[PDB]
Amino acid sequence: TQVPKGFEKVYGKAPAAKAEIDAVADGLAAKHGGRVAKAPIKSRERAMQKINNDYKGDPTKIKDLARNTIIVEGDKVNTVAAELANRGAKVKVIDGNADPLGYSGVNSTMNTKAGIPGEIQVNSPEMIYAKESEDMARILLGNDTYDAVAAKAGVPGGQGHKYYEDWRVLDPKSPEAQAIAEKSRAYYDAVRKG
Amino acid sequence: AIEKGEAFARRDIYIDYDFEDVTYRWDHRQGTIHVRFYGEAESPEPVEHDNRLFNDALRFGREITREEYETGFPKG
């Protein structure tokens, strides 16, 4: 497995980028009544594999060495999105009507003072319940939010990431893609109806 | 978005994904994906069809023309 050129120089700013994006995340999270799921720095092997595969060996192109998630109630997601934009983040607002898989949420990239990008995602508890496995949703939401969301959910949780995995491995001309994407949109739509 | 299926079998497809400053070229005859990042020449190494960033480009990017792709986008 080939170390990318300049890899360690980029990797060493990741702790400082983490502190920076974690500080702004918990600011904004504690502003609107939400929580921040902080995460460690991307592991070395995976960071290198992702630089080599997604970014053809350029380590300055990887954006999620440092990352976290802001979990807020549904109608605050948008407010938080605008907040990250005002701090210069690159912001992707996903609505379920364009994404072939019908997911919704916010992703943003922040160029931190340490000289590398940080990733801050934002979503509601309902969306995270829907997309992530139970183990994952329990960590992101905490045990009590998880249990509250699951009791009031109208759909079994945790199917979203499943559909993504089945869709992602398909060849771009696959006869199977369209049916999987439809199943994913119908799933996330049922979540959002309630 | 550029959904998998009909279009990729129909013809060449060119994709802009501005969130990550990346473009892709699909050659339907050869069945190959190539990547071109903003401000760069196209990478010679083909891209695997289950590649993470490519599938992000399908979900969240937009279709462009062959001329737009070949002209390229200034580095962000």
Short mmCIF file of C-alpha atoms in Angstrom, two decimals:
data_model
loop_
_atom_site.label_atom_id
_atom_site.label_comp_id
_atom_site.label_asym_id
_atom_site.label_seq_id
_atom_site.Cartn_x
_atom_site.Cartn_y
_atom_site.Cartn_z
CA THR A 1 0.00 0.00 0.00
CA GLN A 2 1.61 3.24 -1.23
CA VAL A 3 2.03 6.19 1.15
CA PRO A 4 0.92 9.33 -0.73
CA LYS A 5 3.41 12.11 -1.33
CA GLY A 6 3.16 14.70 1.41
CA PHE A 7 0.80 12.44 3.36
CA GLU A 8 2.35 12.88 6.80
CA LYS A 9 2.58 16.65 6.42
CA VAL A 10 -1.19 16.78 5.85
CA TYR A 11 -2.02 14.12 8.46
CA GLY A 12 -0.30 16.06 11.26
CA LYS A 13 -2.65 19.02 11.00
CA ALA A 14 -5.66 16.76 11.59
CA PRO A 15 -5.67 17.02 15.43
CA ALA A 16 -5.64 20.83 15.19
CA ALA A 17 -8.34 20.77 12.51
CA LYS A 18 -10.39 18.47 14.74
CA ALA A 19 -10.15 20.85 17.70
CA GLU A 20 -11.16 23.71 15.43
CA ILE A 21 -14.20 22.06 13.84
CA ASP A 22 -15.19 20.51 17.19
CA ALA A 23 -15.15 23.94 18.84
CA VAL A 24 -17.45 25.49 16.22
CA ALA A 25 -19.63 22.38 16.13
CA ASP A 26 -20.33 22.44 19.86
CA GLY A 27 -20.92 26.18 19.76
CA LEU A 28 -23.60 25.80 17.11
CA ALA A 29 -24.95 22.59 18.64
CA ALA A 30 -25.37 24.09 22.11
CA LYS A 31 -26.95 27.18 20.47
CA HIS A 32 -29.99 25.37 19.03
CA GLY A 33 -30.52 22.65 21.61
CA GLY A 34 -28.59 19.86 19.95
CA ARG A 35 -25.61 17.55 20.29
CA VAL A 36 -22.26 17.05 18.59
CA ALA A 37 -21.01 13.54 17.89
CA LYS A 38 -17.25 14.03 17.82
CA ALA A 39 -15.05 11.38 16.22
CA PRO A 40 -11.32 10.59 16.20
CA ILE A 41 -9.02 11.42 13.31
CA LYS A 42 -9.45 9.14 10.30
CA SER A 43 -7.26 6.07 10.72
CA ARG A 44 -3.97 6.08 8.82
CA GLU A 45 -4.57 3.12 6.48
CA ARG A 46 -8.07 4.23 5.58
CA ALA A 47 -6.98 7.83 5.08
CA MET A 48 -4.27 6.63 2.71
CA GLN A 49 -6.57 4.27 0.84
CA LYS A 50 -9.14 7.06 0.42
CA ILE A 51 -6.50 9.54 -0.78
CA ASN A 52 -5.19 7.00 -3.30
CA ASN A 53 -8.63 5.84 -4.54
CA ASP A 54 -10.90 8.89 -4.40
CA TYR A 55 -8.23 11.53 -4.88
CA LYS A 56 -5.61 9.74 -7.04
CA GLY A 57 -2.88 10.13 -4.41
CA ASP A 58 -3.19 13.84 -3.62
CA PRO A 59 -3.50 14.14 0.19
CA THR A 60 -4.44 17.79 0.06
CA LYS A 61 -7.79 16.80 -1.50
CA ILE A 62 -9.13 14.69 1.39
CA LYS A 63 -11.70 16.57 3.46
CA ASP A 64 -12.79 14.24 6.29
CA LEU A 65 -9.58 13.56 8.18
CA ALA A 66 -11.29 15.56 10.93
CA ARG A 67 -15.05 15.27 11.08
CA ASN A 68 -18.08 15.48 13.31
CA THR A 69 -21.87 15.48 13.20
CA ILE A 70 -24.30 18.04 14.57
CA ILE A 71 -27.64 16.54 15.59
CA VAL A 72 -30.47 19.05 16.00
CA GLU A 73 -34.23 18.92 15.61
CA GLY A 74 -35.55 18.91 12.08
CA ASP A 75 -36.52 22.54 11.66
CA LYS A 76 -33.16 23.73 13.07
CA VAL A 77 -31.07 21.80 10.51
CA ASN A 78 -31.47 24.65 8.03
CA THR A 79 -30.56 27.27 10.62
CA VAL A 80 -27.33 25.40 11.42
CA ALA A 81 -26.60 25.06 7.68
CA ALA A 82 -26.76 28.85 7.26
CA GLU A 83 -24.47 29.18 10.28
CA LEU A 84 -21.72 27.05 8.75
CA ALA A 85 -22.07 28.95 5.48
CA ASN A 86 -21.58 32.26 7.29
CA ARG A 87 -18.27 30.88 8.60
CA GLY A 88 -17.07 30.24 5.07
CA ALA A 89 -17.82 26.50 4.94
CA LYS A 90 -18.56 24.91 1.58
CA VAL A 91 -22.09 23.62 2.21
CA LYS A 92 -24.10 20.87 0.48
CA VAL A 93 -27.83 20.89 1.28
CA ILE A 94 -29.34 17.56 0.24
CA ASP A 95 -33.05 17.29 -0.29
CA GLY A 96 -34.83 14.04 -0.92
CA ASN A 97 -36.22 15.20 -4.29
CA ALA A 98 -32.85 15.31 -6.12
CA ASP A 99 -30.73 12.58 -4.52
CA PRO A 100 -31.58 9.30 -6.37
CA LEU A 101 -31.67 7.63 -2.95
CA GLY A 102 -33.97 10.24 -1.36
CA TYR A 103 -31.70 11.06 1.57
CA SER A 104 -31.81 14.49 3.23
CA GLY A 105 -29.28 16.25 5.42
CA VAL A 106 -26.45 18.76 5.39
CA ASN A 107 -22.77 18.29 4.68
CA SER A 108 -20.17 21.01 4.89
CA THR A 109 -16.44 21.38 4.47
CA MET A 110 -14.46 23.88 6.49
CA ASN A 111 -10.96 25.07 5.69
CA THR A 112 -9.48 25.30 9.18
CA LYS A 113 -6.66 27.49 10.44
CA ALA A 114 -4.43 24.40 10.53
CA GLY A 115 -4.48 24.33 6.72
CA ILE A 116 -6.66 21.27 6.05
CA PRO A 117 -10.40 20.83 5.61
CA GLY A 118 -12.76 19.70 8.33
CA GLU A 119 -16.11 18.01 7.69
CA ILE A 120 -19.22 18.96 9.67
CA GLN A 121 -22.46 17.09 8.93
CA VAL A 122 -25.88 18.10 10.22
CA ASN A 123 -29.10 16.13 10.38
CA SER A 124 -32.14 15.39 12.52
CA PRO A 125 -32.52 12.40 14.85
CA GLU A 126 -35.21 10.97 12.57
CA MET A 127 -32.93 10.96 9.54
CA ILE A 128 -30.03 9.41 11.44
CA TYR A 129 -32.29 6.72 12.90
CA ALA A 130 -33.42 5.97 9.37
CA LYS A 131 -30.01 5.86 7.74
CA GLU A 132 -27.60 4.34 10.29
CA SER A 133 -27.54 0.95 11.96
CA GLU A 134 -28.88 0.89 15.51
CA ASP A 135 -25.38 0.73 17.02
CA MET A 136 -24.43 3.77 14.99
CA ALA A 137 -27.56 5.74 15.70
CA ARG A 138 -27.22 5.04 19.41
CA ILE A 139 -23.75 6.59 19.41
CA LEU A 140 -24.78 9.60 17.31
CA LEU A 141 -28.05 10.31 19.15
CA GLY A 142 -27.31 8.90 22.56
CA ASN A 143 -29.29 6.05 24.05
CA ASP A 144 -32.24 8.16 25.21
CA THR A 145 -32.80 10.10 21.99
CA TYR A 146 -32.45 6.80 20.10
CA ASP A 147 -35.13 5.15 22.19
CA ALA A 148 -37.46 8.16 21.92
CA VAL A 149 -37.08 8.27 18.13
CA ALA A 150 -37.54 4.51 17.69
CA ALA A 151 -40.79 4.45 19.68
CA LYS A 152 -42.31 7.25 17.61
CA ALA A 153 -40.90 6.03 14.30
CA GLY A 154 -43.28 4.73 11.66
CA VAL A 155 -40.65 2.65 9.90
CA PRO A 156 -38.00 0.21 11.07
CA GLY A 157 -34.76 2.06 11.58
CA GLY A 158 -31.43 1.54 9.96
CA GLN A 159 -32.31 0.55 6.39
CA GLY A 160 -30.93 3.64 4.63
CA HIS A 161 -27.24 2.71 4.65
CA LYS A 162 -28.23 -0.75 3.41
CA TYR A 163 -29.79 0.61 0.20
CA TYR A 164 -26.78 2.86 -0.33
CA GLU A 165 -24.41 -0.13 -0.13
CA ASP A 166 -26.47 -2.16 -2.64
CA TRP A 167 -26.76 0.82 -5.01
CA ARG A 168 -23.14 1.95 -4.77
CA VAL A 169 -21.60 -1.33 -5.95
CA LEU A 170 -23.71 -1.37 -9.14
CA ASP A 171 -22.15 -0.65 -12.52
CA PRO A 172 -23.39 2.70 -13.94
CA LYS A 173 -25.53 0.91 -16.57
CA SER A 174 -26.90 -1.71 -14.15
CA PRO A 175 -30.50 -2.92 -14.73
CA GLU A 176 -30.79 -3.15 -10.93
CA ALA A 177 -30.09 0.47 -9.89
CA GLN A 178 -33.48 2.02 -10.59
CA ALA A 179 -35.41 -0.44 -8.38
CA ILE A 180 -33.04 -0.02 -5.43
CA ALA A 181 -33.10 3.76 -5.63
CA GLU A 182 -36.91 3.69 -5.67
CA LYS A 183 -36.97 1.54 -2.53
CA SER A 184 -34.62 3.98 -0.79
CA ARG A 185 -36.67 7.07 -1.68
CA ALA A 186 -39.88 5.40 -0.55
CA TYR A 187 -38.19 4.48 2.74
CA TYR A 188 -36.85 7.93 3.56
CA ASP A 189 -40.15 9.49 2.42
CA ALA A 190 -42.10 7.38 4.91
CA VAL A 191 -39.75 8.57 7.66
CA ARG A 192 -40.31 12.25 6.77
CA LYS A 193 -44.11 11.97 6.51
CA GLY A 194 -44.15 11.48 10.29
CA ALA B 1 -28.04 13.96 -9.97
CA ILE B 2 -27.12 11.45 -12.72
CA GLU B 3 -29.00 8.20 -12.00
CA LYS B 4 -27.47 4.82 -12.85
CA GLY B 5 -29.03 2.92 -15.74
CA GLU B 6 -30.55 4.13 -18.99
CA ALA B 7 -28.33 7.14 -19.78
CA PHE B 8 -24.98 5.43 -19.14
CA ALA B 9 -25.89 2.72 -21.60
CA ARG B 10 -27.26 5.29 -24.06
CA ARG B 11 -24.17 7.53 -24.44
CA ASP B 12 -21.11 9.22 -23.03
CA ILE B 13 -21.85 11.11 -19.80
CA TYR B 14 -19.94 14.08 -18.37
CA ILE B 15 -20.43 15.05 -14.73
CA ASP B 16 -19.59 18.09 -12.60
CA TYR B 17 -19.64 17.74 -8.80
CA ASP B 18 -18.87 21.19 -7.45
CA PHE B 19 -18.94 20.22 -3.75
CA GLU B 20 -15.62 18.38 -4.24
CA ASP B 21 -14.28 20.32 -7.26
CA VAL B 22 -14.28 17.16 -9.39
CA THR B 23 -15.51 16.08 -12.84
CA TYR B 24 -15.91 12.65 -14.44
CA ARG B 25 -16.06 11.30 -17.97
CA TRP B 26 -17.97 8.11 -18.78
CA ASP B 27 -17.25 6.29 -22.04
CA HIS B 28 -20.20 4.01 -22.68
CA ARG B 29 -18.47 1.96 -25.41
CA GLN B 30 -15.43 1.14 -23.29
CA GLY B 31 -17.39 1.13 -20.03
CA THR B 32 -14.80 3.34 -18.33
CA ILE B 33 -14.85 6.19 -15.84
CA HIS B 34 -12.13 8.81 -15.80
CA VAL B 35 -11.76 11.64 -13.29
CA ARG B 36 -10.62 15.25 -13.82
CA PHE B 37 -10.19 17.51 -10.78
CA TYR B 38 -10.68 21.26 -11.04
CA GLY B 39 -7.55 22.91 -12.40
CA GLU B 40 -5.91 19.68 -13.57
CA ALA B 41 -5.63 17.42 -16.57
CA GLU B 42 -7.67 14.22 -16.58
CA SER B 43 -6.08 11.49 -14.48
CA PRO B 44 -4.85 8.58 -16.62
CA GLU B 45 -5.92 5.89 -14.11
CA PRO B 46 -9.55 4.75 -14.68
CA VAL B 47 -11.93 4.93 -11.70
CA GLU B 48 -13.65 1.87 -10.22
CA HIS B 49 -17.39 1.92 -10.64
CA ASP B 50 -18.01 1.40 -6.91
CA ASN B 51 -15.70 4.32 -6.02
CA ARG B 52 -17.00 6.46 -3.15
CA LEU B 53 -16.45 9.91 -4.66
CA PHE B 54 -17.78 8.84 -8.06
CA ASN B 55 -21.02 7.57 -6.52
CA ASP B 56 -21.24 10.84 -4.57
CA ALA B 57 -20.91 12.66 -7.90
CA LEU B 58 -23.80 10.63 -9.29
CA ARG B 59 -26.02 11.42 -6.36
CA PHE B 60 -25.24 15.09 -5.89
CA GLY B 61 -23.50 16.34 -9.05
CA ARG B 62 -24.89 17.58 -12.33
CA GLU B 63 -24.50 16.57 -15.94
CA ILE B 64 -22.32 18.75 -18.19
CA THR B 65 -21.31 18.60 -21.85
CA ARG B 66 -18.22 17.12 -23.48
CA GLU B 67 -16.98 20.62 -24.30
CA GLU B 68 -17.43 21.84 -20.71
CA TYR B 69 -15.58 18.79 -19.41
CA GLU B 70 -12.76 19.15 -21.91
CA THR B 71 -12.41 22.87 -21.26
CA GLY B 72 -12.19 22.22 -17.53
CA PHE B 73 -12.88 24.23 -14.42
CA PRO B 74 -10.47 26.67 -12.72
CA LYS B 75 -8.92 25.32 -9.54
CA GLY B 76 -11.05 26.25 -6.54
#
